[PDB]
C-alpha cells in the first residue's frame, strides 16, 4: 500500500508491434498506429494520479527476481554458521 | 521562444471591474499545466487562486473564494484574470505560471510544475 | 504550514561554506521545490522534487533535504552567491514558501 507514500508524471504504453520478452527494457517516444508529427503521437499515457486526488488511486509495486543460477554465492541469508 | 506576456503596473480604486493579460507564446499552451502564486510587495507570498485553462475548471483556495476568477481565451491565447469588487489587500506584484517539465516533456506535460518562465510581470495593485 | 529560514542575515565572504535551514511541519517528502530571486528579477528555478537540479543555474548550488528538515548547503562559494533564497513545497496543497534572508557585508 504506497497510496500515502505514492502525480501525473508515470507512464504505460498502449501501442506495441508485439508482447516484450522477460523482462525488457524497450523506450520509443513515438509512431502511434494510424492518427510523425501528424495525428500518430506520443503512444504513452500519463497516469491520473494528483494531490489533489481506492482502486483509481496510486500504489508502488516492486519486484525481487532471485536468481537461482548455479554461481559463487554473493548474497546469503543471515543464517549463523557453526564449525564443520 | 517560451514567453508569457504579462501586463503592465496599474493604480485604480476600490470597487471598479478589471481584466488583466497574460499571453502566453511560443510553445503549446493546451499540453502545459497553469500554476498560480501570488506574491505581496515586499512580504511573503500566499495562492491567490488556480484554475485549469484547459476547460476552465475552477478550483479556488477556501480562503479565495470567489475573490479573483481567471479566464483564458485560447483565440489569443491570454489569460485574464477578472475582479468584480476591487480590494485593498490585493495590492502586489501578481505572477502567473505555466508548467516546467523534465521528465518527458513531451509525454503529457500537464500537471507537471507551476514554474517555467514569466514575462516583465504584472505588478497588480488591487 | 509555516516555513523556517536561518539566519535571516547570513555574512559570510568568499569562499565561505555557508548553509541555511529550511525546516517544514510534516510529510513533504516527494515533491519539493527550491527557487532564487536576484533583485528586481523573477525567481527561477534551483531544485524540483528535493532531488533534481534544474537547468540554467551553476552547478555549483545544491539543495539537501533530511525527512521534515531541508538545508540549502554551498559548498564552494563564489563572488556572485550573495543573494536571497526561498523554499516552495508541492507535495501537498496549498504551496507555501519561505521567509527568505539579506546578505550584508
Known amino acids: 500500500n504506497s497510496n500515502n507514500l505514492d502525480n501525473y508524471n508515470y507512464l504505460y504504453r498502449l501501442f506495441r508491434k508485439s508482447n516484450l520478452k522477460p523482462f525488457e527494457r524497450d523506450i520509443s517516444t513515438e509512431i502511434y498506429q494510424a492518427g510523425e508529427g501528424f495525428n500518430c503521437y506520443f503512444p504513452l499515457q500519463s497516469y491520473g494520479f494528483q494531490p489533489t486526488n481506492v482502486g483509481y488511486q496510486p500504489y508502488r509495486v516492486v519486484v525481487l527476481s532471485f536468481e537461482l543460477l548455479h554461481a559463487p554465492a554473493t548474497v546469503c541469508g543471515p543464517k549463523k554458521s557453526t564449525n564443520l | 521562444q517560451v514567453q508569457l506576456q504579462q501586463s503592465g503596473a496599474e493604480v485604480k480604486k476600490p470597487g471598479e471591474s478589471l481584466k488583466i493579460s497574460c499571453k502566453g507564446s511560443?510553445?503549446?499552451?493546451?499540453?502545459?499545466?497553469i500554476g498560480w502564486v501570488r506574491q505581496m510587495p515586499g512580504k511573503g507570498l500566499e495562492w491567490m487562486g488556480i484554475?485549469?485553462?484547459?476547460?476552465?475548471?475552477?478550483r479556488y483556495s477556501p480562503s479565495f473564494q470567489g475573490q479573483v476568477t481567471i479566464s483564458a481565451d485560447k483565440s489569443i491565447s491570454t489569460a485574464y484574470m477578472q475582479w468584480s469588487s476591487l480590494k485593498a489587500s490585493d495590492t502586489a506584484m501578481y505572477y502567473c505560471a505555466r508548467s516546467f517539465r523534465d521528465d518527458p516533456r513531451i509525454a503529457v506535460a500537464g500537471p507537471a510544475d507551476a514554474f517555467d518562465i514569466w514575462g516583465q510581470g504584472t505588478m497588480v495593485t488591487v | 504550514i509555516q516555513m523556517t529560514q536561518s539566519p535571516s542575515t547570513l555574512s559570510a565572504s568568499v569562499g565561505d561554506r555557508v548553509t541555511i535551514t529550511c525546516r517544514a511541519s510534516q510529510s513533504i517528502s516527494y515533491w519539493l521545490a527550491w527557487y532564487q530571486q536576484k533583485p528586481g528579477k523573477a525567481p527561477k528555478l534551483l531544485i524540483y522534487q528535493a532531488s533534481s537540479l534544474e537547468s540554467g543555474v551553476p552547478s555549483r548550488f545544491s539543495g539537501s533535504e533530511s525527512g521534515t528538515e531541508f538545508t540549502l548547503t554551498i559548498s564552494s562559494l563564489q563572488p556572485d552567491d550573495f543573494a536571497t533564497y526561498y523554499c516552495?513545497?508541492?507535495?501537498?496543497?496549498?504551496?507555501?514558501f519561505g521567509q527568505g534572508t539579506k546578505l550584508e557585508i
Open positions: 484554475i485549469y485553462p484547459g476547460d476552465s475548471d475552477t
Open positions: 511560443g510553445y503549446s499552451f493546451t499540453s502545459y499545466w
Open positions: 516552495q513545497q508541492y507535495n501537498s496543497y496549498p504551496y507555501t
